[PDB]
C-alpha cells in the first residue's frame, strides 16, 4: 500500500472537540510522513516522549492514535506524563509510561468569539481522577454535600462541566489552544503504519 496517513485532516480540521469529550482518530495501513509535522513552524508545543522525532520516520508501528481537543494556554503543561491539574485529573490523562508526542498551537484566531466562545467545555468536578486515556462525557449532577441531588442542579449540586471564556482579548494563558496527542502502539500484530523507504 502507498496511501499517506491522514495527518492533514487531523491537524487541519475545522472544529476540535472539547477536552472532556476528546476525539480519537485511529490511523492504520498507511505510510506516515512525519516530516510535515516537525518541519512545520506552526506549532507552539512539540514534545515527544518515549521516542525521538528524528528516529520516527524509520520506525514501524501497528497502530497510531490521534487524540485532539482544545484547552487553554496555562493548561498545555498538563498534557504530559506525570502531571496534575483539572485537565490531567478530570479530562485527559497520559500514562506515566507514555510513548508518543504532544503537539499544540494557539488557536485564538479560530476559537474565540467577540462575546466569548462558550462551545468548548472541560470537566470541573469528578469523584475520582481519570485513568490514562479514559474518556468521561457524562453530565450527571455532582453531589458535593451529604444531601443527595436527585439529578437536580442546586446548592452543593454542581453541573460537572465548565465553559471556557475564549475571548479574543484574553491573556495568552486563557486563550484557546488546539492539541494533538499522537500515541504509537506496537502490539504483537502486523505493523501497518511505517515511514518512507
Amino acid at each position, epitope marked *: 500500500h502507498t496511501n499517506l496517513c491522514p495527518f492533514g485532516e487531523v491537524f487541519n480540521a475545522t472544529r476540535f472537540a472539547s477536552v472532556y469529550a476528546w476525539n480519537r482518530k485511529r490511523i492504520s495501513n498507511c505510510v506516515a510522513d512525519y516530516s510535515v509535522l516537525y518541519n512545520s513552524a506552526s506549532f507552539s508545543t512539540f514534545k515527544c516522549y518515549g521516542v525521538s522525532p528524528t528516529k520516527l520516520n524509520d520506525l514501524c508501528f501497528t497502530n497510531v492514535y490521534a487524540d485532539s481537543f482544545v484547552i487553554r494556554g496555562d493548561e498545555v503543561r498538563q498534557i504530559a506524563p506525570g502531571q496534575t491539574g483539572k485537565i490531567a485529573d478530570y479530562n485527559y490523562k497520559l500514562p506515566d509510561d507514555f510513548t508518543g508526542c504532544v503537539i499544540a498551537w494557539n488557536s485564538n484566531n479560530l476559537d474565540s468569539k467577540v462575546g466569548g466562545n462558550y462551545n468548548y467545555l472541560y470537566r470541573l468536578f469528578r469523584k475520582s481522577n481519570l485513568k490514562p486515556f479514559e474518556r468521561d462525557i457524562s453530565t450527571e449532577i455532582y453531589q458535593a454535600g451529604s444531601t443527595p*441531588c436527585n439529578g*437536580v*442542579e442546586g*446548592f452543593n449540586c454542581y*453541573f460537572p462541566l465548565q465553559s471556557y471564556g475564549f475571548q479574543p482579548t484574553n491573556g495568552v494563558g486563557y486563550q484557546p489552544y488546539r492539541v494533538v496527542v499522537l500515541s504509537f502502539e506496537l502490539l504483537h500484530a502486523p505493523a501497518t503504519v511505517c515511514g518512507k523507504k
Partner: antibody
Amino acid sequence: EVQLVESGGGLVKPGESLRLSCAASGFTFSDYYMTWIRQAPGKGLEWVSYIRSSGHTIYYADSVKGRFTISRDNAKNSLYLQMNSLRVEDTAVYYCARGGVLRFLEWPLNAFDIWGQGTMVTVSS
Amino acid sequence: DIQLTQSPSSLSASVGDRVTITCRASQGISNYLAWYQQKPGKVPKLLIYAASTLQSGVPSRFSGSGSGTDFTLTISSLQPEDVATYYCQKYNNALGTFGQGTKVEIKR
C-alpha cells in the same frame, strides 16, 4: 433600566402550540438562570420551568414535562417558552423571573428579584 | 421534591396588629427562601430573600427569619396597604417551588 418584558400571550385552541418571549434589558442576561412561573385564574403561583445560565441544565414541573420547552438566546437577550399540546388547565398568566448568578462553589442567595409584567394565555375552543 | 406548607391559609387582623405567617419545608432548604406580596391581579413583589434579607424599597415593618425548615414572615405593624396574599418560595435548587399562599385580610 433593569427589566423583563414578556410577549406572546393569546387565545389558543386545545392541542395547538404557542410561544412566549421574555426580553431582558439593563443587566447581563447570560449571567443569570431564568424561570417561567404561571398562575391560573383564582389559584396560587406555580413554578413551571428553569434554564441554566447557558442552557446546559433544564427542569420542568411534572404538569408540563414533554409539552413545554424552555430556551434562551443570550445574543438576543431573550428567554422563550415553547408550549405545545396546550390544555385547558394551561390557561394562566405566565411570568418570567430571573434567578441568580451562578458563581464558583456558590448557589446564589440573590435571586428572583426581577419579574416580567406577565402575559395571559387562554386555552379554549 | 421538597414541599412547602404555608400557615395560616387566611387571616383577618386590624391596623397595627402583628401578623405572623409560617412556611414549613418538608426537608432542609438552608436559607434559600423568599417571601412575596401579591395584590389581586398584580405581579408578585419580592419582600424577603435569603430567609431574612429585606429587598430594597420594602418597608422595615416586614421581617423574615428561619433556617432549615421553619420560616416566618412577620408584619410588625399591619397597615391598610398590606392587604394581599403572601407566598413563600424555596430556591435551594432549580425547582423554585411555591407555597399555597396566605391571604391577609384587614378588620376595620
